[PDB]
Amino acid sequence: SVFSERTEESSAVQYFQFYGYLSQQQNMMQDYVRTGTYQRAILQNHTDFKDKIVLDVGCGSGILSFFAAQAGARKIYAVEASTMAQHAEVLVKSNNLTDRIVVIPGKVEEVSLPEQVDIIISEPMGYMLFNERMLESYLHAKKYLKPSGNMFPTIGDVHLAPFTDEQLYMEQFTKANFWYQPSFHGVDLSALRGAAVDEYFRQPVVDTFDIRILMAKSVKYTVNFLEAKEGDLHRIEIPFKFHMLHSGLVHGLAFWFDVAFIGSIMTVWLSTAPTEPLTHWYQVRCLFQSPLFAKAGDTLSGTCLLIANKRQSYDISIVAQVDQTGSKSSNLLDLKNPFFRYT
Amino acid sequence: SVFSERTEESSAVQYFQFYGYLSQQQNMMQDYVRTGTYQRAILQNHTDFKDKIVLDVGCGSGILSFFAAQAGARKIYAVEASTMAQHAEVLVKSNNLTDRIVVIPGKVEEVSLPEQVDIIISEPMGYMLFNERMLESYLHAKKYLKPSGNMFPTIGDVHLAPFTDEQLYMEQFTKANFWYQPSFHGVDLSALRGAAVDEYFRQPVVDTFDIRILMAKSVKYTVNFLEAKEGDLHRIEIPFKFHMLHSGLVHGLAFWFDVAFIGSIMTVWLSTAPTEPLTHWYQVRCLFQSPLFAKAGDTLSGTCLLIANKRQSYDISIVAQVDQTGSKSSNLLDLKNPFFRYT
Amino acid sequence: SVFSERTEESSAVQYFQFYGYLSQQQNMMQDYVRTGTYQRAILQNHTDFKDKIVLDVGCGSGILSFFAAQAGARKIYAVEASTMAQHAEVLVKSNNLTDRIVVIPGKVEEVSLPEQVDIIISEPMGYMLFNERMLESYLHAKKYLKPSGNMFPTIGDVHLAPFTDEQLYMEQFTKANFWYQPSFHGVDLSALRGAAVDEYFRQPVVDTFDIRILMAKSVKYTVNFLEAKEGDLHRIEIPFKFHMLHSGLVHGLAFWFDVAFIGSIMTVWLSTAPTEPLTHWYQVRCLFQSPLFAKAGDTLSGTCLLIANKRQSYDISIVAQVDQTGSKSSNLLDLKNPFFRYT
Amino acid sequence: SVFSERTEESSAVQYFQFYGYLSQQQNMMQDYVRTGTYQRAILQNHTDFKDKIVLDVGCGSGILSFFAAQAGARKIYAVEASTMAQHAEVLVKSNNLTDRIVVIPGKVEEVSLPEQVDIIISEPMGYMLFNERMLESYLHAKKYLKPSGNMFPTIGDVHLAPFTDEQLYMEQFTKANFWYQPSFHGVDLSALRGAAVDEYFRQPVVDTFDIRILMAKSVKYTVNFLEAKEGDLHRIEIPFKFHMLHSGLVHGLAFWFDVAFIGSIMTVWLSTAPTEPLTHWYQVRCLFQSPLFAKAGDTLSGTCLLIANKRQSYDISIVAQVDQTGSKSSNLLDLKNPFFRYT
Ligand SMILES: [N-]=[N+]=NCCCN(CC[C@H](N)C(=O)O)C[C@H]1O[C@@H](n2cnc3c(N)ncnc32)[C@H](O)[C@@H]1O
Ligand SMILES: [N-]=[N+]=NCCCN(CC[C@H](N)C(=O)O)C[C@H]1O[C@@H](n2cnc3c(N)ncnc32)[C@H](O)[C@@H]1O
Ligand SMILES: [N-]=[N+]=NCCCN(CC[C@H](N)C(=O)O)C[C@H]1O[C@@H](n2cnc3c(N)ncnc32)[C@H](O)[C@@H]1O
Ligand SMILES: [N-]=[N+]=NCCCN(CC[C@H](N)C(=O)O)C[C@H]1O[C@@H](n2cnc3c(N)ncnc32)[C@H](O)[C@@H]1O
Numbered sequence A, B, C, D: 001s002v003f004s005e006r007t008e009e010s011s012a013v014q015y016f017q018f019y020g021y022l023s024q025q026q027n028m029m030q031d032y033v034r035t036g037t038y039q040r041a042i043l044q045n046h047t048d049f050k051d052k053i054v055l056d057v058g059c060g061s062g063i064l065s066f067f068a069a070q071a072g073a074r075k076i077y078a079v080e081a082s083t084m085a086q087h088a089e090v091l092v093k094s095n096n097l098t099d100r101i102v103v104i105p106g107k108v109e110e111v112s113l114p115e116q117v118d119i120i121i122s123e124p125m126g127y128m129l130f131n132e133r134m135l136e137s138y139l140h141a142k143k144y145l146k147p148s149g150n151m152f153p154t155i156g157d158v159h160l161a162p163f164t165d166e167q168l169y170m171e172q173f174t175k176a177n178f179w180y181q182p183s184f185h186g187v188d189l190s191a192l193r194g195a196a197v198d199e200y201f202r203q204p205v206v207d208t209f210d211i212r213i214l215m216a217k218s219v220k221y222t223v224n225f226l227e228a229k230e231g232d233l234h235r236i237e238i239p240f241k242f243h244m245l246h247s248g249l250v251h252g253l254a255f256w257f258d259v260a261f262i263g264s265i266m267t268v269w270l271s272t273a274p275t276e277p278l279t280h281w282y283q284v285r286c287l288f289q290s291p292l293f294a295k296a297g298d299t300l301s302g303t304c305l306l307i308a309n310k311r312q313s314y315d316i317s318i319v320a321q322v323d324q325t326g327s328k329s330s331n332l333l334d335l336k337n338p339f340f341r342y343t
């Protein structure tokens, strides 16, 4: 299958074991912003669902399918690969919806659907939008979508912006300098200080922050799920040119994302921006190895390159330079192993 | 291989990826009780190491091998399966011990050692002692041990005792009660209330607690690492009979462990008991879905059964009953998925 | 008679037996807020009593009749159905008011009065205002009222507001959890877990609380005793629409009431609101079996339905929903069987 | 029926309504002394039950029947008059004992049982043992007992003892003196002070107390349930002659009771004495209207006469005199309406 070919079995087992727990589903369901915004998107666009055929990619507990049913859907195919599928089936029965919701256990890349659908719904967003690589399953599911079809969400925007945060930056060295001592219980650890530094800096930092640390207006990279193909997400190149609003040291790039549900009646937005109420996605920060000094009015230009790996994540390569000075910085990050800093 | 036959590949990959991070090594090394006690055990029994051949099973960063070198070992074979093996090599060179410490990358079940050894050292204890199933690698390594050889640690004691803690019980029930709702965003979840309770109550609670919650003197189960065989750890049956010292509700069983290093010069103990300074193992509690009432003087009897699974952990079945009343509680726990309650 | 047709004799016997005790009369008289506010209402409106004919419905000890006598009433007919009527007569004689207070033993629905009256006084309010169904006797007594006559109290307001109180909810669930035990002295009780939850949650909680647990401004339901008929109190339907001021879990609805004495000289209010000094009515809370999550700005809508029963009480049906999400809770309560939660 | 003839319906309705609540059943079941002692008496006398026919009078939840089943009874008839019978039926099914336990809804005086039984079990004791008058149903049930049959409990002992408690005695007047004021809000209440005193002294006090208030060895009145007739409980005359152990003022009589289960293997005692752990029966105290002074060694003689009434209770007539001084005191009390004073 397309899924097994892009994924190490080891990663997949862990991934679907994770989503097999009711507590994790609960975690997602109790994110009011997420769940409520999906419900609003679906219900306020009832004409996109009423008496339509629907596909729910990765239904988990099945909540989105129930929202589609509330909006009047004729038939909902709810596809789910973890054991949560058996729990979803139990809820479909106890809510008297077996004639309208059909739970299909398995991977959307491997199961068979009996008919084409009018609309696809899913919640495939991970950290930085792309983490977990579920967007590829979502786009893959388009093989079942009528030419007339719609996608909820319809588009996804990744926002990038430079930030300054001296304490976050210094924390890394404070942690790594544990290894810079000549006699830890009689052992000289210092030879591993460099490797410890590299490791800490390879971790994206998951948490939220005050918007005042942002030093320029964000740049946006848009994915149109109606047009995009799977292959488009294997290599993501995000060029950027920031016009600095404040003078100072840029310690890295902050990432967040929006998705939009573009229905017949209205467009509904779900945002994880630091200006918005907090979600279980928080925001993501990637540090530079070396901070860059920029004056207000200067331009910070470069590229963020995301390369998909078989651990259902991305290798992140960020290169930035201040155009007025030629000062340059790189970093390589592994999105699979983030540092959860939120307290 | 003996390891691959008892272990799911998915589990092993993740497992050895975890110990591949320097930050985790740092976490472990910075448990001063652990590191300091190991060093004390080794150095105060230096005559057990002087001019001897040593095997260090799962050396990680290599700290125990360095302690064995400090104690005068002639040769130390340091076996490690994760990528940490390459970092250990760097420390062996920068500490000028290439003539004494030999890092052999790989699983102890799969490598070949050039000679038999006088002593085996390792730190194979997980949560509740047995988690991670590293004790089996440790015992497996005995094929390289001379008939007169020693093992550090030499024995392990598991301690069990009944506790009362309404707040913990209620904290978990509060989480499970989510699945009781008859109309979460218009969806009836209650059909999964039973499944949710089961899941939450399958989580061992890892943290520390005040010793005043204990309702009887603890019971001891001892494993002698010098005499025990690998196969002995596939099924571990721990009988218990508590004489209740206080009247009240027993909400579950508390678990901790001691290990002893029995050297020629002296015996050194490493304890994770709640009467002792805290370690990174904390203590482990298993909750009952329904507490048992017992009066002072009553007897609380039963068995804690551990069955090894292929995810490098154990399925735990705890059965306890008040002998005078027949009030009985059975419980199932998944040691692989603990609730870390320390903040 | 109207009383016997709407009342089981079993309830009536116990009811008038209760009020036959001097200790209960004492308990009520020592509610200083009640007694003081009544005296103040009557004396500050002395012109509504001066040389008037008065009917006191359910005089008990006769205290209100004495207030009416102090205010200059020409004649007071004091109707009382319990044996307390003989004690009231003793007080009338020892206070030398035989020429102004006439005790009429019996039920107000059954006795015969020699003339029509200018004003009716009573204290017919029970828990949640309507409990004991004495308001119907009070309204029934209007058959004796001259066309322009007055009533003290004149109007009653029921106040409803949503509250959050995890502690109370978990206390009740904790009590119900007894019936969840799978081996109580060797007996499985869990088949009755559902019934136990229902029973416990059918109890209104009588007590006071901090006003900060309220999550929205209260809603008002008004009964005008001058206009209302008996039959109006057989089915009381109270619609509500709350605008949530705080985000959180709504565990139920809080109830209290105000009554107003609208006299010629001034209007005097008697309040049992939690913002006011405590009375023997306290306040009443009705728990949902499952709490509802609402965010600030959401609207919580529904109905509180009170159905009069033959046990001199009401069956309470509460249906509430968060309008933005469809999250819904229905609940049934037995006002006859309250849980008195005190010190 | 015998029950209907000795009980006014109102009392019966309230009475069986009371036991219709799971919370009340729970209250009784959670008395560990009571339930544990019954379980012990039954199980430790297993030869009295194994392969026998059993009648359980007023089974409530059915707990005693289950104990009889644990002990090996062949067939158990569980008679229960309140609605609790439907709940007992549910537990019989869910414990897979429908083949052994038959639930019979109704009063034991009114139902028809098919066969004679080898043993009758019940828990018919109320306050002062005799309150609620359920012992008469217990004795009535002997019409179904084989001539060689047994009764569990087999005997009941009521204990009487003189006490001194200045505070309690004084409390009565402190409460009654509320009425002794010439202007309670302008009303002279004093004419009712005498009636108020009389009322308070007619109430037995239910609570526990320190055994140091007891002034003599208790006197015992024994009822042998195997020999006794129903009619023996209509009028209970308890003569007493106390030998004073301490000098002081006797303010009244304290009451408690024991029951004994006399089986083939052993005799098991259940005690509600103040020297024993507290039960939900507490103890009962009845005041003298006038305290009696007694010297150590003096004799306090007289009679306690209990007269059964139609409210499923007793009128209590106590007459006492100090023989050496001729000092005499009496009181008459209504056991149906006790004053619950505990904490
Ligand atoms: N951070 N975050 N949230 C990330 C979203 C988590 N989750 C959403 C759950 C539910 N829709 C809800 O909104 O409540 C995704 C689910 O999709 C499943 N799933 C993943 N891939 C596949 C696949 N290829 N075929 C079938 N199913 C798959 C997973 O097992 C998950 O259960
Ligand atoms: N909680 N806790 N602490 C549990 C102990 C963690 N850890 C000890 C680390 C080291 N002592 C140090 O502190 O330096 C276990 C290590 O052994 C390795 N390891 C596991 N099994 C094998 C195997 N079969 N063959 C080779 N090596 C193996 C792992 O990779 C780890 O590196
Ligand atoms: N909760 N609360 N507080 C509510 C307290 C109510 N209580 C007020 C006592 C009096 N105001 C005082 O304070 O002195 C009611 C009395 O009216 C009598 N009464 C009830 N119904 C009838 C009836 N249909 N016909 C005649 N009399 C009746 C009862 O027997 C009581 O004695
Ligand atoms: N403790 N205590 N208080 C006194 C005991 C309360 N209760 C014990 C409950 C149960 N056995 C247990 O041990 O849990 C008595 C029950 O008997 C019933 N009952 C009363 N009289 C009759 C009658 N004449 N015919 C049928 N049944 C009757 C009542 O309805 C009660 O349910």
Ligand code: NA
Binding pocket: B155, B157, B222
């Ligand atoms: Na030992």
